[PDB]
């Protein structure tokens, strides 16, 4: 009515200003990233300040329009997204206190140092020395003391700060009409709109629980296969009927289990598949990898790269008097400009990373036609799910045979397939329960449920109950173990990885069944299939306009997530693990303690 026209005019002006402001800020950011200099950092600072101020002013002024008065099914979502900027709805003193404590925690995590008892002269840092010794060492004592020193130095300095950060975050969440901060994080997945696709926040927990109940039967089997192998290197310590030590998992926090591969590889007779020698012999170039990736993307019917992609984006290290921080990234600067930044080298890992980044760029191009406030993904995990499925399709042996790196007369062996499946399982199934448990612990601690004096005890009780990791040393309540992770200390969410892991296999199975394939699911390719490209592009262009349930139904045909595709993917590995593990036992007991006599 009278207010719809006003809302439409306000949205038009907001979009018109925001497009230019965001483009200016993004251009300044890319200019700084391309060449590091104090001038570039300054220009980035004044570029971001104006954008933040304009966004704050627009959010403040947009509250004059009542939500219930309007009804357009498209204006309402934009106004709701714009108004949800209540991070400033606190008294200024608390804002300064929270900002200062966040900066203090981040800085103290960055500057963390641990020294040796024998000689205080070395004082190894985290990136130079702790990661390598936690990844490729064998001695028990060195890992034990490094772990203990890191945990002590982190917890004893981070516990009191976290105890007050929690209270201020709860106050901030309550000031925005939310139950607690966990609800604030869970509010990303809520989907309201057309009937039948409504999704509430409180369901997000329960569904996750159900999914875990179908991951446990497989994961336990893996826990057996490593354990026996881990008894070969360390005979006396690890017990057949117990859990695994925290510092023997191959990583500082035990998040991933990839580094255990050289010790738990099944067959030593033949190595894995590496076509780097073929690239070296055939005289490949950095541009050739991206050309092949673009050819693969075109083969399914997706649009090709813009003619500014090659001219503007950098794909090779400058190799001269220029400073660039090395990290593969895809940039959507706005106004129809797309770039990829990568320190390309001739190696298969860079090839797969290029596939991932090109998938990101394709998704960004796909959702471009939508308005500015709805120019995002449906949820957190869709970008990474798309990248992962593209990489999985690109890494198959038959695709390599088609390219020409592998010889035409190839005799694929089942043992290589088992090795590849074991590597994939160690990458994914090893990290899923850790993510679930950390997210559950944070959710419980934010809801004023776990008491202030029983944090670490409950943390290790859950760690011993769910994942099956036992502490080698006892920790007093003064310690703060969860603060040792980057995401916990720097205030990032963590369930997006779980959601992306669930989503990617559903997407892969849908694209494979749409590609007319039979047989094992780990040899499938979406290439040379216009139907799969059409099915994907029907969803890639929706963006954030509608509920993610509709997009999921468009892709796979289900309203909610499911975990069966992962089990179908890993079925041969499950069979082999059951075959191998007849003699040993399955499961762990919580009674064991290594330090206890």
């Amino acid at each position: 009515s009278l207010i719809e026209e006003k809302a439409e005019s306000f949205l038009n002006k907001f979009n018109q200003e925001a497009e230019d402001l965001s483009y200016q800020s993004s251009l300044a950011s890319w200019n700084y990233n391309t060449n590091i200099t104090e001038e570039n950092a300054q220009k980035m600072n004044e570029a971001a300040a104006k954008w933040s101020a304009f966004y704050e002013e627009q959010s403040k002024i947009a509250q004059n329009f009542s939500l219930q008065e309007i009804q357009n099914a498209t204006i309402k979502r934009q106004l709701k997204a714009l108004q949800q900027s209540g991070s400033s709805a606190l008294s200024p003193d608390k804002n300064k206190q929270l900002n200062t404590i966040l900066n203090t925690m981040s800085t103290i995590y960055s500057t963390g140092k641990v020294c040796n008892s024998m000689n205080p002269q070395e004082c190894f840092l985290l990136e130079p020395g702790l990661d390598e010794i936690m990844a490729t060492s064998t001695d028990y004592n060195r890992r034990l003391w490094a772990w203990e020193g890191w945990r002590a130095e982190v917890g004893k300095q981070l516990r009191p700060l976290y105890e007050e950060y929690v209270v201020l975050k709860n106050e901030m969440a309550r000031a925005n009409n939310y139950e607690d901060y966990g609800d604030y994080w869970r509010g990303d997945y809520e989907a309201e709109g057309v009937e039948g696709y409504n999704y509430n926040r409180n369901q997000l927990i329960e569904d996750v629980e159900n999914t875990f109940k179908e991951i446990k039967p497989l994961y336990e089997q893996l826990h057996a296969y490593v354990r026996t192998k881990l008894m070969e290197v360390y005979p006396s310590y690890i017990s057949p009927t117990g859990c695994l030590p925290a510092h023997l998992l191959g990583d500082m926090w035990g998040r991933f289990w990839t580094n255990l591969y050289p010790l738990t590889t099944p067959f030593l007779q033949k190595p894995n598949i590496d076509v780097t020698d073929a690239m070296v012999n055939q005289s490949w170039d950095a541009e050739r990898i991206f050309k092949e990736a673009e050819k693969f993307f075109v083969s399914v019917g997706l649009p090709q790269m813009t003619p500014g992609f090659w001219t503007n984006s950098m794909l090779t290290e400058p190799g001269d008097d220029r400073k660039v921080v090395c990290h593969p990234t895809a940039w959507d600067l706005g106004h129809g400009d797309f770039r990829i930044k990568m320190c390309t080298k001739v190696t298969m890992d860079n090839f797969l990373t290029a596939h991932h980044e090109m998938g990101h760029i394709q998704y960004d191009m796909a959702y471009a036609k939508q308005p500015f406030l709805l120019r995002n993904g449906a949820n957190e995990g869709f970008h990474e799910a798309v990248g992962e499925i593209m990489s999985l399709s690109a890494a198959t042996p038959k695709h390599l045979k088609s390219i020409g790196l592998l010889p035409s007369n190839f005799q694929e062996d089942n043992e290589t397939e088992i090795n590849f499946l074991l590597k994939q399982a160690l990458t994914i199934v090893g990290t899923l329960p850790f993510t679930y448990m950390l997210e559950k612990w944070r959710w419980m601690v934010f809801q004023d449920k776990i008491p202030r004096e029983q944090w670490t005890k409950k943390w290790w009780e859950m760690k011993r109950e769910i994942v099956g990791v036992v502490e080698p040393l006892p920790h007093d309540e003064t310690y703060c173990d969860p603060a040792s992770l980057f995401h916990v200390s720097n205030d990032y969410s963590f369930i997006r990885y779980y959601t992306r892991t669930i989503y990617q296999f559903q997407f892969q199975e849908a694209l494979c069944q749409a590609a007319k394939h039979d047989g094992p699911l780990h040899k499938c390719d979406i290439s040379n299939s216009t139907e799969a490209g059409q099915k994907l592009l029907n969803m890639l262009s929706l963006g954030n306009s509608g509920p993610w349930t509709l997009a999921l139904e468009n892709v796979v045909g289900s309203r909610n997530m499911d975990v069966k595709p992962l089990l179908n993917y890993f079925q041969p590995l499950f069979v082999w693990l059951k075959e191998q593990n007849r003699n040993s036992t399955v499961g762990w007991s919580t009674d064991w303690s290594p330090y206890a006599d």
Binding site: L2, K6, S9, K13, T306, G308, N312, H335, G336
Partner: protein, 195 residues
């Protein structure tokens, strides 16, 4: 002979904005279509009411050339019977149009690193424009019941806005130059003819 001047309309250094387009009338001269094909690309070349194939036999009384600069995506909006922003607030064509529309890229001349902010377009208007009508008024728009009283603010907006082109934008946001030729045959001696 006396050739029609198809040079000021196709080789001009500067083009006017959308909301104030340039109109030139020509008569009593000699028109040649060979000069028109002066640029290779011709991204858009669409003719209504006349044969796109070479037809110089027909003689008209007045020829109107309307020139302006728009974006790439709006080129499809310069057509008879279209709805949009440019076609409803800036430049409108009638349903009985008999002419030709030509649009070609101009990125190499109308794009600067800092940004060319001279080009403008109108964003708010009370009522749709009648065909072949221009508006150059800059009063403050008023979408609310409260009187604006000559000052911007809440529910008060300034109509005109700027493009701000740059030489890294995409092909859809790059500057394009558009010229429209309209042919009118009134009750008068025939003036415009062929060679």
């Amino acid at each position: 002979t006396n050739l029609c001047p198809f040079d000021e309309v196709f080789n001009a250094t500067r083009f006017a904005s959308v909301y104030a387009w340039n109109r030139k009338r020509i008569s009593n001269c000699v028109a040649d279509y060979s000069v028109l094909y002066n640029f290779a690309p011709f991204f858009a070349f669409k003719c209504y009411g006349v044969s796109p194939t070479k037809l110089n036999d027909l003689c008209f009384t007045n020829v109107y050339a309307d020139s302006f600069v728009i974006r790439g995506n709006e080129v499809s909006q310069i057509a008879p019977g279209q709805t949009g922003n440019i076609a409803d607030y800036n430049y409108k064509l009638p349903d009985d149009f008999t002419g030709c529309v030509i649009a070609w890229n101009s990125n190499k001349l109308d794009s600067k690193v800092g940004g060319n902010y001279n080009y403008l377009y109108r964003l708010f208007r009370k009522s749709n424009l009648k065909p072949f009508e221009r508006d150059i008024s800059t009063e403050i728009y008023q979408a609310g019941n409260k009187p604006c009283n000559g000052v911007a603010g809440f529910n008060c907006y300034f109509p005109l806005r700027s493009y701000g082109f740059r030489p890294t934008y995409g092909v859809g946001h790059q500057p394009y130059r558009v010229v429209v030729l309209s042919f009118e045959l009134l009750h008068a001696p025939a003036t415009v003819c062929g060679p």
